[PDB]
Amino acid sequence: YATLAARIAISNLHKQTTKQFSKVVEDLYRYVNAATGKPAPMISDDVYNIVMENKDKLNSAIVYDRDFQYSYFGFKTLERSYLLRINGQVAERPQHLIMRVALGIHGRDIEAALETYNLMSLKYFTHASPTLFNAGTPKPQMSSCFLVAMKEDSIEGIYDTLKECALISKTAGGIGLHIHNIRSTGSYIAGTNGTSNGLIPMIRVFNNTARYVDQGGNKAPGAFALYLEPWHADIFDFIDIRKNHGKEEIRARDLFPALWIPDLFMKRVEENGTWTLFSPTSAPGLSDCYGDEFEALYTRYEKEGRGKTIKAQKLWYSILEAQTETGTPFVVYKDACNRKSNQKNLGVIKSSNLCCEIVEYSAPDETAVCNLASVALPAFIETSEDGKTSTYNFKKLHEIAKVVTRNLNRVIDRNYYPVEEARKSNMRHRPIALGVQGLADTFMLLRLPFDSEEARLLNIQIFETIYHASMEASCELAQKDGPYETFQGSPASQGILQFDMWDQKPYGMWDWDTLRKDIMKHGVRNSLTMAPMPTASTSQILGYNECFEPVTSNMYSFQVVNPYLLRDLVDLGIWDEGMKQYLITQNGSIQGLPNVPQELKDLYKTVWEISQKTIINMAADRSVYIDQSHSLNLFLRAPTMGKLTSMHFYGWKKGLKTGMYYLRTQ
Amino acid sequence: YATLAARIAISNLHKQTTKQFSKVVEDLYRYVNAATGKPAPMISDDVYNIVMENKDKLNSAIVYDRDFQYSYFGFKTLERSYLLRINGQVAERPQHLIMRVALGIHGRDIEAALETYNLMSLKYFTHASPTLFNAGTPKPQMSSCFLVAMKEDSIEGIYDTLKECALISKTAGGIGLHIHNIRSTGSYIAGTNGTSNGLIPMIRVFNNTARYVDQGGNKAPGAFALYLEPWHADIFDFIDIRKNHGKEEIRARDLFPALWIPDLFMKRVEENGTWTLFSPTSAPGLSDCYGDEFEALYTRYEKEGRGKTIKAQKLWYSILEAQTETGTPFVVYKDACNRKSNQKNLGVIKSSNLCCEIVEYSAPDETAVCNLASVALPAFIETSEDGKTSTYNFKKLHEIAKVVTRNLNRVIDRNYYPVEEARKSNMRHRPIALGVQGLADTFMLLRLPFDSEEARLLNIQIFETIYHASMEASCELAQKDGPYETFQGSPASQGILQFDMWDQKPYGMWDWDTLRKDIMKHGVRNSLTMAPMPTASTSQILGYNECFEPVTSNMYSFQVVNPYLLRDLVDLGIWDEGMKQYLITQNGSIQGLPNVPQELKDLYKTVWEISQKTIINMAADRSVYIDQSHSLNLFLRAPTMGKLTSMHFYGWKKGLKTGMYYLRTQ
């Protein structure tokens, strides 16, 4: 169909752009801001000198054919926010952006540079947007998220923290900020008859700084996620922070509430029992432990009159309300996250990030950071048997995941850190996050319904391979540069890998025993490797479905129909106008369509037609090979208090870390 | 009349309170917060030990009769916000508050303590509210205002500054904050295609922190004043910040805009000429000079295309609009303030304070502070000739002003400083601010219309004496403790006193030559002594008219009629119900009342009936004995663009520093 608008706008772009890469780096580097007279380079000194000392090798390495791998919407995304502009006009071709990104990561290892270039240009993998924006640029802030500790229960602590979010928000990246330690409404303050205002008014300050620190282009999200434990006395308002009605002095519409849930809360809800709310000042230490230690300390404070008791299910019901209307708060299980983190030698983890996938340690003086990349799952499909059936090439997937791991690991050293808390932190533990995109495609291309036994297996299979790969790559790194600073004492140091903490045998596609031997011997370079993220933008750049979720509709959206569906409907000579209309009219749903094979109706279920138990199951299956966590969106058809209840508890009992990211509805 | 409700509620208070002072200090000191279990003392260790080591001397010094010096509204003010409360109930009697304040200032100089006590209990003078609140208490923040420098044109500078206002707003005191150095809307920012948002959105952040840092009781005002020079490119919005209509993202209703006006602006308005707006980044140095140096540098930048030119009177007209509707921006003349400051050896002064009276030097690392007290002008009236006419006792006024000066000077050393910038600053230059209240009364009691030749003279006379006194006291201090750190190089070091900088001979009631001799010889302890403030609350505590303004109505307000008026109307046997009604119905105006002597109509003009030229004149007369500045409110009857125009220019040409504080209307 109109894949023809892609080619047009692509070679239009070729016409408005200098072909030779090294000339473009000259242009971008030499740039002066006409309106102001200021020399405003867009390449670093470092990457400039590199390109100049290697210009023939580099220019000739670039294959411009590989520009036509982009769908129309992929390309318009690139154009509109990614390709570097000279004075309003676009100056970078897609190949130049990639080549720049390759250099920004690799520096003088031109061999590494050429390997990344090739693999990216061919669509094997892609790095997260901040890397695509800033690698090879003079303030190269390439990380996607910062996990910030509230420094202290004081105006000074609060305003130091506010300063840090502000300094972070100048640049690319999202912020997860935990606040369990701020005293609740009405608590005593020494030196006044004044009472405390609590969380909400302090939230309104943060929300306001989110709105003010724009102007980083549109590279900042302008939103923070905030993490709270449900025992905090300010909980009812906190969860209603994105509510669309009620008083305005109580809402904070540019921020996301995220719950940090102890298992105790859930038991109490299930047991239909009491829940007690404390101010952190009448209940110290509560966020600084978990599991049993928490259970013991909580129960004691609860017996010692230190707080306020109400019915667990009163809170529970309010949460489901807030979630049904707004899609938030997110739900992340504190204990599951801490019980099963390779970072537990550092102390208690107090939050996740803005997309509920990063599970790293943060403290007033260490603000945890992470660099993300995603693998293009469908690129490892081949027909390779001999005949008609397609298989999945796991060798290449292991090979490619080792490359990404090495990339992400360099990005740590060549990263610009907005705040000293992020450099201190990331240099010590060197966490890393790999993800995937196009899981739904992979299945579709391989003729598998999402809810099949075969899909369940491949899910496990793929993730086993990425995790094995990354730990292998990381361990090779530890052999060249030493383990990361804080590796002694870690579960990985004691031979305990992620699935072990889930008390499971690995699916056994790869030799874990060899790997585990070498890790106890040599260490790893990275405390953490795996955390599948939303890929909202980058999967649009590679033309794939986000992430690891099924299609939302088969009507993608001018509106363009799912190419695999189209393919199949045409090959069955049943694609007419009745088809174009039935699918528009049902929004990319093909069930209940008179003349369509059952094989296709299974294959092209939309996420609303797939059962959430299956969804949670696959999240549980893959989770044992996930160092950190993943952004589990949930989708509900005709939503009810009961259906939502069984979904949290289902994931909760599965041992999940992120029980829910967004709740999406209608 | 109902002065009888005073006695009732006074001796009611006696019944609910322990008579003996040292028991009350015990009570207050020993206080424990029942709800929380926390020991919450309300007296310092230091003042406790003092009282205990001197309890008989102290308790017996206290005259409780002196509790009945308070009008009903004076007393209700004391009760409602000043007298220390034990668990909701009032624990301090007025005499205890005073005695505490005396100690908090004097420490172990019990002789000084007893002298202050006596003088205050008898209503000779009073210190500003923060002193009344906090002297003798464990965080004794006794200063009324902080003049804060915007630290830098950066997110870091801005958020360091935000932190400092927040830390200051926890406690008593107002903030004047100058921002001439923040780049305006649309300016370049290096490292993004992002433009700057300018002032307004950054103001909204400050306004929001004003709202959030309450809870210091109601001792913080919850408002800042912001100072800008009218060449700043963000000027039109900045002046409209308290506008009651229009868009909400453009207003900031809890802050006050104050203009810092160069003479150039005014000439240009008068000449009907061009005015040029710059961003500080395209015009550096502009706020860091004045007079000629400014004129030269401004003109050059204006010739070099560096900014945007429009008609002076376009801005002028908008200012008058904003002022007519909202009463702001305030108007303070930058050049007059800098030309005539004894602090010019330190560098350019960049703002005043929240009440337009403090004119002190502030810089990113020095935040200027000031401690205020006011003299009760009417307390120095006596009949003392022999017969019927009353005179004014200037000897006692010189004597009392020397006492206050010594008090204020101790408060500097025993002050708690919220931020290190304020301690650095105040310890070096030791500024001080004395004021007055009850000028209108004094005149009334002395049978003088405000606009008489006799009133004009006494105005000059009083102020000459306070200024002479304070410099004398201060110079005696310099003899015991040395001059203040930065006295060398000051105008006062070169024999140049305030009136000299106005190029005037002093009225000559006191020997200035002797004083001036001694100052060049020994120095002063205080860089600055005099800055008449609004006395909004404390004059209500002493039962006098604020400040140095005339009565606003003769219907004070249950509604209580002006006691002097009443006195006089009754003595003429013309006070009936027709009288009670004519004055209610005219809101304390007595002109155009059929049966009232002309002598009384002159004597009891309301500030709306008095001409503003006279008002400005007296402000000009007194200003030559004012180190710093004063809070000139203006009052306009039937306000018009022309009348307001001639008033600014009139004061501007008089050489005033504060041309206008509030513009008050109807």
Ligand SMILES: Nc1ncnc2c1ncn2[C@@H]1O[C@H](COP(=O)(O)OP(=O)(O)NP(=O)(O)O)[C@@H](O)[C@H]1O
């Ligand atoms: N003036 C204020 N306005 C609003 N909230 C305040 C204020 N002062 C303190 N708080 C809140 O109370 C907490 C303590 O503030 P902090 O700056 O530690 O004051 P403090 O004098 O140290 N009182 P305390 O912490 O009780 O010893 C912080 O969480 C503040 O948010």
Ligand SMILES: Nc1ncnc2c1ncn2[C@@H]1O[C@H](COP(=O)(O)OP(=O)(O)NP(=O)(O)O)[C@@H](O)[C@H]1O
């Ligand atoms: N991300 C942002 N959002 C809004 N305003 C900003 C942002 N970054 C900078 N500014 C404004 O631009 C000014 C410069 O900010 P600063 O923190 O100095 O950034 P910088 O990288 O140093 N850019 P420059 O000052 O041009 O070298 C400050 O007045 C900020 O208010």
Ligand SMILES: Nc1ccn([C@@H]2O[C@H](COP(=O)(O)OP(=O)(O)O)[C@@H](O)[C@H]2O)c(=O)n1
């Ligand atoms: N323009 C953008 C988009 C995302 N991000 C960051 O990455 C997160 C979104 O993750 P994602 O994986 O869905 O987005 P992409 O990496 O595909 O653009 C946001 O929460 C931010 O933390 C950013 O900094 N700037």
Ligand SMILES: Nc1ccn([C@@H]2O[C@H](COP(=O)(O)OP(=O)(O)O)[C@@H](O)[C@H]2O)c(=O)n1
């Ligand atoms: N309750 C109060 C009242 C005034 N003030 C400070 O003193 C200023 C008012 O000056 P003023 O002389 O009119 O008030 P008083 O000293 O008479 O209470 C305010 O701008 C604040 O700077 C305060 O800190 N707390």
Ligand SMILES: [Mg+2]
């Ligand atoms: Mg504290």
Ligand SMILES: [Mg+2]
């Ligand atoms: Mg800067």
